[PDB]
Design a protein around this ligand. Structure first.
Ligand SMILES: Cc1ccncc1NC(=O)[C@@]1(C#N)CCOC1
Ligand SMILES: Cc1ccncc1NC(=O)[C@@]1(C#N)CCOC1
Lengths: 304, 304
């Protein structure tokens, strides 16, 4: 009973957080095996951030300029390289706490947990989603750069995000663990605007199935729709167009509840056209889109 | 920038989760030093739960009947006792991962993180609040009993909750780590109804201060109020009455923003009387009450 915005247990990621200092800039690093991953802007001063030439700035840096501290002990840096927008610092010690891991580049609409860190120390964990405009609505202050996003499948941590930037609109931009930014953002102190933040339709439907499973059924109506009719409504409300791929992934939820995907689409259509009318669904007064169909299945079944 | 419902990093609690089996019932245990804490209803069959006499049921149980498994290794049980609604299983090995810890009985309105577990394995972490009717709106399925609630102050874990029950209304009831239930609930399969779920006023105000700090200011008005005038409105909307103690704890937020507590109360009063008018605050279309003033301060300052 009950449905919560749950994050993955963070322990496996906590054992990987280190502090990286270069000059007078300190941020977070991710220590996996004998490599520490961190945003390349760690080599920048506030002035450098205006228009940095990272290759040129890196020439003035040696292995001894990167100070890596795991807890209260100093790691010896024996190599450094730049891969896209991340720095890989080869250390002389493999992290004894390295979990089974993969680096994955996620698609917009996918969810993940963020372990927010400051000075290599964790402050908290929350569940996020890569928005369709490639930003994340996180909670990050100065010093939080290098904090990571991830998913867990039993014992394997799939790292998907590394925090780099706060846009002037308070939304967040970052990279995958290969250093490639999600979206068109660059690691520069220049005004970069985000595109339309559309609603992740398939996630809203998955959350409506979670609500039915947990007792909230008032929004179920006597109607059905078609993908094309539904998508005309989704276009009007800045919702992502629903495809047969999305319908397919909702299949297990449609099967468990006995509510056909297109019937749930008609409920969503009426909710979009009429609003909630002062009512709530799973304790929310708006349509939640940061639960994927896989998250709903996982939570509703007790996957550990 | 940004404000999220954050949970504490769960690592320190993950290293304490064990599986406890008695007969054919399996639930979660908390292993701290050489003691494993678990709900006493682990000794019950589904039939026993209807009207259990725990002292009588415990007589038919020996140390060897309690199977404690931490990961894939079996702990030897050398003692067992019942303290209120929890069983304390003395094991022959101190948990090497025992963090610095305290057992605290929280007050209604206080928030905490829950590490949801199944068969001694964690499934996720989420932030909760002890409701004013002493229930929690968690996310727990069968097998989740023994999962714990906690807060962290730097390196010390204050355990405050242990999950025991799901009421017929899908809300959750549990105990502190001394085995005393929050509220009037009993560990029996008998219909127990919850009292009025009032809104935690001081938490809503703290969240309104977080919203101002983060850019959402539309709800700020030209009015002020008094504690007595505000409380007449709070009574009507089933909000907890605000006291000078609550005003005092909001002080640092009033000081940082320059918005007097009673002015924020007048904004809250207008929001209660007029609604949001299709608008949102920190991405929510309702007034959030599961952030204490301490949580807002912590998140907005970067406490690790
Ligand atoms: C101040 C802050 C808070 C949260 N996330 C990110 C930031 N800051 C940034 O985006 C930086 C830029 N541009 C400033 C230093 O290099 C990265
Ligand atoms: C089914 C479930 C799911 C989540 N939390 C709790 C429960 N169940 C309960 O409350 C129990 C009772 N009464 C059933 C066995 O003893 C505790």
């Amino acid at each position: 009973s009950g449905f919560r915005k749950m994050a993955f247990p963070s322990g496996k990621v906590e054992g990987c957080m280190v502090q990286v200092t270069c000059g007078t800039t300190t941020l977070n690093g991710l220590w996996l095996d004998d490599v520490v991953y961190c945003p390349r802007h760690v080599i920048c001063t506030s002035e450098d951030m205006l228009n940095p030439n990272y290759e040129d700035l890196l020439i003035r840096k040696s292995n001894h300029n990167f100070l890596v501290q795991a807890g209260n002990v100093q790691l010896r840096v024996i190599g450094h390289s730049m891969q896209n927008c991340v720095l890989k610092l080869k250390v002389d010690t493999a992290n004894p706490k390295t979990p089974k891991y993969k680096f994955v580049r996620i698609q917009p609409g996918q969810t993940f947990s963020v372990l927010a860190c400051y000075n290599g120390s964790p402050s908290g964990v929350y569940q996020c989603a890569m928005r369709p405009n490639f930003t994340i609505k996180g909670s990050f202050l100065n010093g939080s750069c290098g904090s990571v996003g991830f998913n867990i499948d039993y014992d394997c941590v799939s790292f998907c995000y590394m925090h780099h930037m706060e846009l002037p609109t308070g939304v967040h931009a970052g990279t995958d663990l290969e250093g490639n930014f999600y979206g068109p953002f660059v690691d520069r102190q220049t005004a970069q605007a985000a595109g339309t933040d559309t609603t992740i339709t398939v996630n809203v439907l998955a959350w409506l199935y979670a609500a039915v499973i947990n007792g909230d059924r008032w929004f179920l109506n006597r109607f059905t729709t078609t993908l094309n009719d539904f998508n005309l409504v989704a276009m009007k409300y800045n919702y992502e167009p629903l495809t047969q791929d999305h319908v397919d992934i909702l299949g297990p939820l449609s099967a468990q509840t006995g509510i056909a995907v297109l019937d749930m689409c008609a409920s969503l259509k009426e909710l979009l056209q009429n609003g909630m009318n002062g009512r709530t669904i799973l304790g929310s007064a708006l349509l939640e889109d940061e639960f994927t169909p896989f998250d709903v299945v996982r939570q509703c079944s007790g996957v550990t």
